[PDB]
Design a protein around this ligand. Structure first.
Ligand SMILES: O=C[C@H](O)[C@@H](O)[C@H](O)[C@H](O)C(=O)O
Ligand SMILES: O=C[C@H](O)[C@@H](O)[C@H](O)[C@H](O)C(=O)O
Ligand SMILES: [Zn+2]
Ligand SMILES: [Zn+2]
Lengths: 413, 413
């Protein structure tokens, strides 16, 4: 039986380590979609998190950086962030965890040798390897139909294998309708100059056509710190007249990733986004006024985290998830996961990888699981010491909810 | 390939229940038009059908009734027609069907709890709820340009959403021209004292102006039992020289609801109209003499129903529809629907709801569909007995024709 923190620690760590993970938000693609799925050490080293970091150290111009080849970029970052300075940051640590996880030894710092490993392997094989090592059963993608490369694949019949699931990303439609409406009409969606019945129906038709083609687990959008709802704006009316009705009809949840301030430093590309605290008014209104709609929410500002948890206490149709981006750091992952558990028990989704490069699934889940395991150990021990019987079976059940079941139960699949 | 009677009944009922309905005559309005759209339990209980019925029981004078507030009128009707006597009449049965459909429970007879349901929703939300429950996809309104409230609404650009369609009601123009002509000139339509070229072209202009503003699926008028045509009167002349030619040009059907005798009991208001049998001469003449015009007809007298069916056998430019008002009772709906199918096959429109209160769509259609399903089952079964085997697809086709396709195909939309 489990009758001590010591015994508990072992059981929790084992259960957490063995629980197959459903990664509900990533930037990975089923291997059959082609090169859009990024992988290998050079891709790991050029993750935009490391681009931002290297630029704080290197005298190499950002324009010169983008001009270099992928290998040149990787060599520079490795040299600047691993050799000239110890790789102690979270993103650098992550690269190391991946290498070790694949059987490569960071002790040698032999980059040329690490590279050879990847060269003698295919995309399909590396996917098998990584999913096995990271113990990830299901990966949810981010599918942007407004991206020409991504859109052509779906239109031409490309479909993910069983391990990969689609999520209809809609940032251009909701946040740039003034420019995006012209593309809809180019694709046959007769949206008019004014927001009338015709415009509302065509936008709904656009969403329905893409839902049928992708069979998404949810529709998503990243939003700025200034997000508000209700709102007399293109976004406010599209959400009110089109997105919500369609989502309820198909019982598809609406995922909102709030707090991103896009391109405060354009020259840095994907690495040029900032953060800002948002008002909870919009989320609060959406949850209260649309009780038949489901909402998946994650916020970027550290200062929004505690109140988001309290908001989940208020509305069952709100399912909070992950420690997103700038929140995806040990210090923050820990505080967020503890506040969440203390006020929500196990009724939340503690994490997602947001993996942009295949191998990251290894470090993202290993770094997170160790922290989540420690929180669970503290929480289980507190009730154990209080006289409660905790069985290994109940631990596996709870761990399964946190890393997989809660999501699937919420999406309705 | 259906050969057993049980499967046949099963497929017919499923097809009827699943078939999205086009309700081609109601007194409902798109929710954006305002409070003109009536809804909720108090509105249901004060429907004029129940006003007439409660007066046969209550000692409360009609004057006092009208003096009462809406909620007080509802309480009296509830007490008098539901508590003091079993609510077995069709209208009272309808209110119950509505409450049950909404998820409310008639068993408790808790009127206050029922009211609480409506109080927590908006008109927009309730229309969404009711259109779904009643599986009604299209509602045809009754739009009267002679009503100040309605007119100004159409003048200020108000447009119904895609679920609602307009029908240009002309009772004041055709039945009260003498008093109405002064309003036509007040609006810039210079009709002359006598019926000449100018008076004819200005009346046409009025019609055309409103057809362009409403884009009605048809033009309508309710007529008395004494209706005649040809006829040297304002109605006879306006119809001959204006209505018909204008209707033919725009290929717009002319709907005539014949048989009502207005205000035989003035104090009852909307619940004070009576019925009388009409001559078929006028309708016979119109169909034969104006073959390029389309006519939608429904009559109020039980005694007019059989010959109307026969008239439809004579003229393809006649499309009979629904079981109107005093005909909208199970006993009459059943005999009417059977006489119609027996002499016209599927070439007619069996029903319309005539809803004045939103929630009525639930009971109007539920009560009618069960009866129409019964008739279909019997007729399909009769040919099955002869050796004919229908396919489930042919059934869905026939059902679609009756509840929606016959109307749109007839109006040409
Ligand atoms: O976590 C960081 C991501 O890789 C971002 O670059 C991304 O834009 C963000 O997660 C999003 O999906 O909107
Ligand atoms: O069913 C009865 C209606 O509510 C009547 O009051 C209405 O005047 C009639 O249907 C009409 O449109 O002439
Ligand atoms: Zn992301
Ligand atoms: Zn009517």
């Amino acid at each position: 039986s489990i009758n001590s923190r010591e015994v508990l620690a072992e059981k929790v760590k084992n259960a957490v380590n063995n629980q197959p993970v459903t990664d509900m938000h990533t930037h990975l693609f089923s291997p059959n979609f082609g090169e859009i799925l990024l992988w290998d050490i050079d891709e790991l080293l050029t993750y935009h998190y490391l681009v931002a970091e290297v630029m704080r150290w290197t005298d190499v111009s950002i324009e010169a950086f983008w001009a270099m080849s992928k290998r040149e970029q990787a060599d520079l970052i490795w040299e600047e962030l691993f050799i000239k300075r110890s790789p102690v940051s979270e993103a650098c640590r992550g690269v190391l965890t991946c290498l070790q996880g694949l059987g490569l030894d960071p002790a040698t710092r032999d980059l040329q040798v690490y590279r050879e490993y990847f060269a003698k392997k295919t995309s399909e094989e590396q996917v098998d390897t990584v999913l096995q090592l990271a113990n990830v059963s299901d990966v949810v993608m981010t599918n942007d139909p407004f991206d020409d490369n991504e859109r052509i694949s779906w239109l031409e019949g490309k479909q993910p294998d069983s391990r990969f699931h689609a999520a209809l990303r809609l940032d251009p439609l909701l946040n740039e309708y003034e420019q995006t409406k012209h593309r809809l009409r180019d694709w046959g969606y007769k949206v008019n100059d004014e927001w009338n019945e015709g415009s509302i129906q065509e936008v709904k038709r656009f969403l329905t056509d893409w839902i049928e083609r992708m069979d998404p687990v949810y529709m998503a959008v990243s939003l700025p710190p200034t997000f508000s709802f209700p709102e007399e704006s293109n976004r406010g009316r599209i959400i009110r007249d089109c997105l919500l009705p369609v989502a309820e009809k198909h019982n598809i949840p609406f995922a909102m990733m709030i707090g991103v301030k896009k391109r405060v430093h354009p020259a840095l590309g994907d690495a040029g986004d900032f953060v800002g605290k948002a008002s909870m008014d919009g989320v609060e209104h959406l949850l209260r006024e649309y009780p038949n709609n489901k909402f998946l929410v994650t916020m970027l500002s550290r200062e929004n985290q505690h109140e988001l948890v309290v908001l989940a206490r208020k509305f069952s149709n709100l399912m909070i998830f992950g420690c997103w981006w700038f929140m995806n750091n040990p210090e923050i992952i820990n505080e967020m996961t503890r506040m969440r558990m203390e006020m929500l028990g196990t009724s939340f989704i503690p994490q997602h990888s947001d993996a942009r490069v295949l191998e990251q699934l290894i470090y993202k889940w290993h770094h997170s699981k160790s922290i989540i395991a420690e929180v669970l150990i503290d929480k289980y021990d507190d009730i154990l010491q209080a006289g409660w019987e905790v069985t290994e079976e109940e631990i596996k059940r709870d761990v399964a909810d946190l890393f997989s079941r809660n999501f699937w139960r919420f999406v309705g699949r």
